[PDB]
Design a protein around this ligand. Structure first.
Ligand SMILES: [Zn+2]
Ligand SMILES: [Zn+2]
Lengths: 132, 192, 48, 134, 114, 195, 196, 8, 176
């Protein structure tokens, strides 16, 4: 099944397959897709949770009385590119419209945030904010 | 890059040489000197070779095959088997033995190819080393008939005695470290 | 130059600073002319 | 005799122990029940000048593991235990090291791929949202 | 030549001479252990550094696809015809274009220079 | 995944390694971290390459390099490595055969594409560091076929030598018949053409 | 934008620099976070001449990140916790049989023979650190933090990873010594394997 | 592009 | 005899829980560790937090801020950094002192690399004749410290200033 002296056809057939599957600019597109799909979410998760507490508020017995607020970001979501008009009504933004009206082609970025309140009342409440 | 092999020397030419001359740089990239021979030395290649040897810097490191630092408590013991014969000959009528003998020994082997190429002499090297370090170094040299050229060096016999009643406990570099420093200095700056 | 069987008259170094320290300012005038002429005429070009 | 004293009786008796590196599927199978007192049988067959070590998986557990020995002369190993009563003790000195290897070559890679997928489940990725959140 | 590490402190032993006995002793500065030196050589420097590269060559290099191979030079040890041949491949090798042949075939591992 | 597989395939970890044993064994670096040593390098190298060509655990972009003289195996999963696809040669025969080009020729209504070629093991992506360990043939038929012996151990083959050129230099006709600075100048002039 | 490869050991020779051979490694924490921190292991040239300096000859020094002054390498190994000279050389020299490499390591061991305590070495690193150090306790903890995180992050950043860092540092030294001996060729910056 | 003595 | 063809097969037992946890104690071969001289030993968690973490906040903590000044002092110290870490012994290295101070001292450090894909078990002989397997809770590599005179840090700094020690170092060590 070897291909002797038919190689000029075969090599350009395999080259054509390469260029059909993978375009000329595939590197830029693939790298950006990696950014959005993985890197953004990993950057969100890598960031340490936010820990906040009051500075001995009320000057009472203060046995850990100041509440502790803990925020943890999760599950980043991206919408399709969208342009909000002067009316404030969201609408999809076609690329050519962005070119003509000098708009910026951008997509909304949403993160789920979980907020926990620890007031040393023996109860901790973990409210969740969806798609902030 | 596009000079010729006729020059047979590194030569700076073109824009960089123009900059060197224009700026009168203290250090040229390739300092060179053309020496014209006076008389018969120009006519005969061998005499020109003699002048070349006179004009080219030569150090002990260039002519030294290898150096080894040994500890030999007794010169007569001759820890190296090879040096037994000539050490025995030298110590049949020993010189400077009355002062003392330093136990640490520096043994230097000189490549015969380099020695004959520069036309150096074992006695000449011994004299130069003796003059450079005065009496602080005692040198023993083989005859040229010996297949391996060996030079044996020991610390000063007077220094080994210290010739001092107090003797000072400073004990700077002891003798082995001092011998290593001597070896490095000899190799780098002998200027034979 | 001091070494025996080396011609003192014709021996020359390419370094102009050495020529100045050893032979003098006039010698450097001539030596600098020679070196510049060498860099100019290596390609075969001619400058008056 | 003190709290920090180490009971070196195991060292004095020169008790010999064997160290083995075993895979996660085997350990997890053992940990599934972990209380039945039985996980398998270790069979060692010796010949004139060659010895082979093998472990058989329990039939209930499954619903051959050859052992490869390693030289222990390059490093001396001992086993010590910290009792819940704060009485440290030494069990013995390691005299042999072994490794447990899977029998299946290709189909085992399928289980490895399943394990990789299970470990990749906690990994979270950016999610595409069709409609902008209001 | 070789560096000996003391048992007591696991540190380098430096040469030292006992004046009383005129005996060379390798003694650590940190610990008092002293050992008589059999070699009796402190420092050896080979300025020529004419060290054979046959020892340095690894027998594994025979597996390399990129290395040239000759069947012209047979192996001395086993007679295998194939033998990858390569130059010094070493900096500070001075000026040597000698070919350090390595016999192919499993486990022969023979290195010869012609 | 590569680290897990390496642990499976008899790679002793640096922590468990006796310092004396390192001298005689190859060091395995993954993304520039010295994971451990392996006593038998060639078997591991062949297994890693088989896995990559089957695309099981090692992704196609992952590059394995073995420096035989320095006893080091380096595996890079890092981003930004530049790679080019090359045909694979086993023995002295190209792995690409007439059946593959027949499936590719009817690329429509056969759903056979470059990804299928990569998965089949006919082609492979090779970065420069791995290029240093690869014997390549410019033209398959000429160099693979037996002749006066130059190399009998070709491991990869170029798909076509004209692919070394870029986008602008590819529009030059008969580039090999020109002086090199002129091809460079045409690359710049083509960007400024009108169309 | 082209950049030199991270998480790799490259040995170069710089004529102008006092170091005859310099080996650099630029380390990034798996690209997850933090700027890339470069740690250099260099060998001083034998050109410098002195009664002690000529005897020692080439002496290895390391330019740890965020420490202003060059630190002798044996001190870094002791700071990591490997006090014994034999163990340091075990990490640096993989086979003790070869005499030349041990000869190369000997001078640096002699230079650091004053410090034989891990805590003292940590204090010395802190004291010569660029950031000011008020007390010995503070200096020791600060230098320990620098070794744990700033230096060679890719090998490890936490989890008691001193052994891994010691082995990789010893690998850098081993490659530098091989380059000095001439057994390995000096790396080339232009190779596109290095240029991510 | 010619030789070592010529031009590149 | 039977030794040339003996076949031994034993049952394997893995108890769900053991009162004493199992660890690995690894000594380097070059150390030449010998247990014959180990008449007594002391293994305990380290206190190096004395030098770098705790009781280092002794004097400034108990200086005597009170009232609003106490509130401000505590809050100021806390917000200045990120609350200094105190003793959490279970996550600290181990110190071994064999035969008291006279004998050698070793330091064990937990193996940082976790065995997420590996487990280690120990087989011990028992009268019932069945092997028992116990998981390895932790791995420790112990390295000795010489029982020799240690240079003082201040003296070490003074000596290092004279990096060019032309005089013999051994005599310097003897002087100390
Ligand atoms: Zn000692
Ligand atoms: Zn053979």
């Amino acid at each position: 099944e070897i291909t002797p002296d038919l190689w000029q056809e075969a090599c350009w057939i395999v080259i054509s397959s390469y260029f059909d599957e993978k375009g000329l600019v595939r590197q830029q597109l693939d790298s950006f897709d990696e950014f959005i799909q993985m890197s953004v979410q990993r950057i969100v998760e890598d960031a340490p949770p936010i820990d906040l507490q009051a500075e001995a508020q009320h000057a009472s017995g203060e046995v850990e009385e100041p509440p502790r607020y803990l925020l943890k970001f999760e599950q980043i979501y991206l919408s399709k590119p969208t342009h909000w008009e002067r009316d404030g009504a969201p609408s999809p933004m076609m690329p050519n419209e962005a070119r003509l009206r000098n708009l910026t082609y951008s997509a909304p970025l949403y993160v789920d945030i979980t907020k926990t309140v620890i007031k040393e009342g023996e109860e901790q409440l973990q409210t969740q904010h969806q798609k902030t | 890059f596009h000079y010729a092999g006729v020059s047979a020397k590194n030569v700076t030419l073109g824009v960089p040489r123009l900059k060197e001359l224009i700026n009168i740089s203290k250090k040229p990239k390739t300092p060179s000197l053309t020496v014209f021979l006076l008389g018969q030395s120009a006519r005969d290649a061998e005499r020109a070779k003699d002048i070349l040897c006179r004009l080219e810097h030569t150090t002990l490191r260039k002519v030294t095959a290898n150096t080894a630092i040994y500890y030999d408590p007794n010169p007569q013991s001759t820890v190296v088997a090879e040096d037994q014969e000539w050490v025995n000959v030298y110590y049949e009528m020993p010189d400077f033995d009355v002062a003392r003998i330093s136990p640490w020994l520096l043994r230097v082997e000189l490549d015969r190819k380099h020695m004959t190429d520069r036309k150096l002499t074992m006695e000449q090297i011994a004299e130069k080393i003796n003059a450079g370090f005065g009496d602080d170094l005692n040198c023993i040299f083989n005859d040229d008939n010996a297949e391996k050229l060996v030079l044996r060096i020991r610390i000063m016999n007077s220094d080994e005695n210290k010739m001092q009643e107090e003797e000072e406990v400073v004990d700077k570099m002891d003798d082995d470290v001092f011998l290593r420093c001597i070896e490095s200095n000899m190799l780098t700056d002998m200027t034979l | 130059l001091s070494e025996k069987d080396v011609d003192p008259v014709r021996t020359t170094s390419n370094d102009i600073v050495e020529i100045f320290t050893v032979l003098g300012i006039e010698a450097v005038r001539k030596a600098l002319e020679r070196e510049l002429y060498h860099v100019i005429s290596f390609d075969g070009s001619y400058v008056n | 005799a003190e709290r920090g004293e180490l009971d070196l009786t195991g060292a004095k008796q020169n008790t010999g122990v064997w160290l083995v590196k075993v895979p996660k599927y085997l350990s997890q199978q053992w940990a599934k029940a972990s209380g039945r007192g039985e996980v398998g049988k270790l069979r060692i067959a010796k010949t004139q000048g060659r010895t082979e070590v093998s472990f058989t998986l329990n039939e209930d557990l499954a619903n051959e593991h050859p052992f490869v020995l390693q030289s222990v002369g390059g490093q001396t190993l001992t086993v010590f235990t910290e009792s819940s009563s704060d009485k440290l003790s030494l069990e013995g000195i390691v005299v042999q090291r072994a490794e447990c290897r899977p029998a299946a070559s290709e189909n085992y890679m399928r289980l490895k791929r399943l394990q990789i997928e299970e470990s990749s489940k906690p990994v979270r990725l950016s999610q595409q949202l069709d409609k902008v959140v209001t | 030549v070789g560096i000996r590490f003391c048992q007591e402190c696991n540190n380098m032993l430096y040469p030292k001479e006992d004046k009383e006995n005129r005996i060379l002793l390798y003694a650590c500065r940190n610990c008092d252990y002293q050992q008589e030196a059999d070699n009796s050589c402190i420092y050896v420097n080979k300025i020529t550094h004419e060290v054979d590269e046959l020892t340095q060559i690894i027998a594994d290099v025979s597996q390399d696809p990129t290395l040239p191979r000759t069947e012209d030079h047979p192996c001395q040890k086993c007679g295998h015809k194939e033998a990858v041949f390569f130059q010094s491949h070493s900096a500070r090798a001075e000026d040597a274009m000698r070919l350090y042949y390595v016999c192919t075939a499993p486990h022969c591992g023979h290195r010869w220079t012609e | 995944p590569i680290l897990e597989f390496l642990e499976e395939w008899s790679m002793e970890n640096l922590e468990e390694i006796s310092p004396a044993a390192i001298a005689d064994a190859t060091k395995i670096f993954v993304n520039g971290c010295w994971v451990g040593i392996h006593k038998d390098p060639e078997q591991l190298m062949n297994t890693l390459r088989k896995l990559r060509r089957q695309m099981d655990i090692i992704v196609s972009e992952v590059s394995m390099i073995r420096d035989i003289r320095e006893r080091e195996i380096r595996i890079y999963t890092d981003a930004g490595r530049i790679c080019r696809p090359l045909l694979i040669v086993e023995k002295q025969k190209l792995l690409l055969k007439k059946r593959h080009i027949d499936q590719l020729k009817e690329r429509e209504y056969n759903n056979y594409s470059w990804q299928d070629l990569v998965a089949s093991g006919v082609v492979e992506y090779i970065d420069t560091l791995e290029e240093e360990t690869v014997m390549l043939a410019m033209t398959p038929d000429d160099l693979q076929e037996k002749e006066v012996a130059y190399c009998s151990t070709y491991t990869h083959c170029e798909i076509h030598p004209s692919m070394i050129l870029g986008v602008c230099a590819s529009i030059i006709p008969f580039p090999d018949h020109n002086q090199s600075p002129r091809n460079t100048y045409q690359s710049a002039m083509g960007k400024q053409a009108m169309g | 934008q082209e950049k030199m490869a991270t998480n790799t050991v490259y040995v170069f020779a710089k004529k102008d620099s006092k170091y005859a051979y310099t080996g650099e490694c630029r380390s990034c924490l798996e690209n997850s976070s933090r700027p890339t921190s470069t740690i250099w292991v260099s060998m001083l040239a034998r050109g410098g001449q002195g009664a002690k300096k000529s005897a020692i000859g080439q002496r290895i020094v390391a330019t740890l990140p965020y420490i202003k002054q060059e630190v002798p390498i044996i001190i870094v190994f002791r700071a990591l916790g490997f006090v014994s000279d034999r163990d340091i050389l075990e990490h640096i020299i993989y086979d003790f049989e070869d005499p030349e490499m041990m000869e190369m390591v000997k001078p640096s061991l002699d230079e650091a023979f004053v410090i034989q305590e891990q805590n003292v070495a940590l204090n010395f690193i802190g004291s010569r650190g660029a950031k000011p150090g008020v007390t010995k306790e503070k200096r020791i903890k600060y230098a320990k933090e620098v070794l744990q995180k700033e230096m060679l992050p890719h090998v490890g950043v936490s989890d008691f990873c001193e052994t891994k860092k010691a082995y990789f540092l010893g690998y850098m030294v081993h490659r530098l010594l091989l380059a000095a001996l001439g057994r390995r060729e000096l790396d080339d910056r232009d190779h596109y394997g290095n240029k991510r | 592009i010619w030789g070592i003595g010529c031009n590149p | 005899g039977p030794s040339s063809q003996n076949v031994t097969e034993y049952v394997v037992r893995v108890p769900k829980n053991t009162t004493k946890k199992y660890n690995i104690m690894a000594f380097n071969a070059a150390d030449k560790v010998n247990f014959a001289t180990w008449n007594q030993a002391r293994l305990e968690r380290d206190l190096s937090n004395k030098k770098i973490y705790q009781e280092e906040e002794m004097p400034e903590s108990g200086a005597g801020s009170e009232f609003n000044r106490k509130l401000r002092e505590e809050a100021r110290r806390k917000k200045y950094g990120i609350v200094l870490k105190e003793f959490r012994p279970e996550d600290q290295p181990w110190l071994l002192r064999v035969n008291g101070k006279s004998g050698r001292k070793f330091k064990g450090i937990k193996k940082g690399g976790v065995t997420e894909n590996t487990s280690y078990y120990i087989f011990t002989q028992c009268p019932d004749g069945a092997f028992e397997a116990f998981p390895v809770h932790n791995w420790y590599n112990f390295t000795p410290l010489a029982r020799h005179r240690t240079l003082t840090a201040e003296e070490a700094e003074e000596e290092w200033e004279r990096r060019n020690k032309v005089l013999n170092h051994f005599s310097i060590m003897q002087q100390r």
